[PDB]
């Protein structure tokens, strides 16, 4: 899941 500290970690949208 998207967490604010971790960018793209387990978060496709942040790429």
């Amino acid at each position: 899941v998207c967490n604010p500290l971790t960018g793209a970690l387990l978060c496709s949208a942040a790429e």
Partner: antibody, heavy 112, light 114 residues
Framework: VQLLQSGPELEKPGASVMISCKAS????????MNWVRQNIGKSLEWIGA????????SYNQKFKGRATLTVDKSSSTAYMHLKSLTSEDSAVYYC??????WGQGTSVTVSS | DVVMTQTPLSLPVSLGDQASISCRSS???????????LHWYLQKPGQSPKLLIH???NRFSGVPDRFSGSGSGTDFTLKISRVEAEDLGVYFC??????????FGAGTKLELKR
């Protein structure tokens, strides 16, 4: 937000260890549970993280195939399994919710 | 992996003094998304780390405003305007731009001068 980890572990070389991290306060399924270890020397090394809503994982390649992360949603608990232990693995292991809040650490000593 | 170089290893201060801790990354931490995922933590003796500053300059919930962070690209600094006793411990920078893996600086021990 509070993360309670299980107590110290002692293992032989080649054996496995399993550590737990019980989360309370915030939404268990809202944060990836990250794991980090603190070596002798105090340096920190990120191991990986798990999404608890459905279970997807991301590993530091250094631990890929050696570490396994899991969760149990029914008890808001995350687990870290690490196999093929050596003395390089003796460390304090932390769980960390979204990289924001840290557990108290679990000591792992790998020795004959 | 991104290597985070922290300086100094040890920073002796008197209570009330200013302190600055620098962290230099081996490549830019500016993400294609425009964010800079550079964070700072403090680990007090016998404690776990606690988050102080996130995304270069944002203070985390509850953190006193004597702590500030700045920087860009590959160079970042944490500043404490006036050191308090509770501030002694080990400071670490961490990056989450280039993941996996997240990486950390080696730690800077803020200690007391005498």
């Amino acid at each position: 937000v509070q993360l309670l980890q299980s107590g110290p572990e002692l293992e032989k070389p080649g054996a496995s260890v399993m550590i737990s991290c019980k989360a309370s306060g915030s939404s268990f399924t809202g944060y990836n549970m990250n794991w980090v270890r603190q070596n002798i020397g105090k340096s920190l090394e990120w191991i990986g993280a798990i999404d608890p809503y459905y279970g997807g994982t991301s590993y530091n390649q250094k631990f890929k195939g050696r570490a396994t992360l899991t969760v149990d949603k029914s008890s808001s608990t995350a687990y870290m399994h690490l196999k093929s232990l050596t003395s390089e693995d003796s460390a304090v292991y932390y769980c960390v919710s979204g990289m924001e809040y840290w557990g108290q650490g679990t000591s792992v000593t790998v020795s004959s | 992996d991104v290597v985070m170089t922290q300086t100094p290893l040890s920073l002796p201060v008197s209570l009330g003094d200013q302190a600055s801790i620098s962290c230099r990354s081996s490549q830019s931490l500016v993400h294609r998304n425009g964010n800079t995922y550079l964070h700072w933590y403090l680990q007090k003796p016998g404690q776990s780390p606690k988050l102080l500053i996130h995304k270069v300059s944002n203070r985390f919930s509850g953190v006193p405003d004597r702590f500030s962070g700045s920087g860009s690209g590959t160079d970042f600094t944490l500043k404490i305007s006036r050191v308090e006793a509770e501030d002694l411990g080990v400071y670490f920078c961490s990056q989450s731009t280039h993941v996996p893996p997240l990486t950390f600086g080696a730690g800077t021990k803020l200690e007391l001068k005498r």
